């Protein structure tokens, strides 16, 4: 009952990836390692965002993740923000922030 993915310990589809790699004008030939590794990176990152947004959604008392939660998850995280720098999240909103100079007293 082993699946290429399950040999590699991944939810992410190693087979799918290894096709998308051949079919995507990346290179002539694609190593059998590549699509494990690649899939494995995508899973890690996907998992990191979900754990963070999961908590955003619990913290704001929800069973379901929404764009905001993902935006919070990413924007409130030094590194993910940097990775998704030039990337607009539809329906995400912006981080509450008012420049101090503008406040009273």
């Amino acid at each position: 009952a082993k699946t290429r993915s399950s040999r590699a310990g991944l939810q992410f589809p190693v087979g799918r990836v290894h096709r998308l790699l051949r079919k995507g004008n990346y290179s002539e030939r694609v190593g059998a390692g590549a699509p494990v590794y690649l899939a494995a990176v995508l899973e890690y990152l996907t998992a990191e965002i979900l754990e963070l947004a999961g908590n955003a959604a619990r913290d704001n008392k929800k069973t379901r993740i929404i764009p905001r939660h993902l935006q919070l998850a990413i924007r409130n995280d030094e590194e993910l923000n940097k990775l998704l720098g030039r990337v607009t999240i539809a329906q995400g909103g912006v981080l509450p922030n008012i420049q101090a100079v503008l406040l009273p007293k």
Binding site: V87, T88, A90, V94
Partner: protein, 79 residues
């Protein structure tokens, strides 16, 4: 000209989200000009995708693909 349809108060709300506290009345025209240029530059590209696919309907992807050429990359419309 629907460019005026972009009301002073819609420009105010936007500015409020951007942390802005006090707005020069000159800005609402200034903003408009910019928003038009941004659209032009996006929609021009979008509808070049439209025309290249021999379509008469602009899709999300057309837009998304344009926003990417413009480094304005967009998540959650079919990326």
């Amino acid at each position: 000209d629907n460019i005026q349809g972009i009301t002073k108060p819609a420009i105010r709300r936007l500015a409020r989200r951007g942390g802005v506290k006090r707005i020069s009345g000159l800005i609402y025209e200034e903003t408009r000009g910019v928003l038009k240029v941004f659209l032009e530059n996006v929609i021009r590209d979008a509808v070049t995708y439209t025309e290249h696919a021999k379509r008469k309907t602009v899709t999300a992807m057309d837009v998304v693909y344009a926003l990417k050429r413009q480094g304005r990359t967009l998540y959650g419309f079919g990326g």
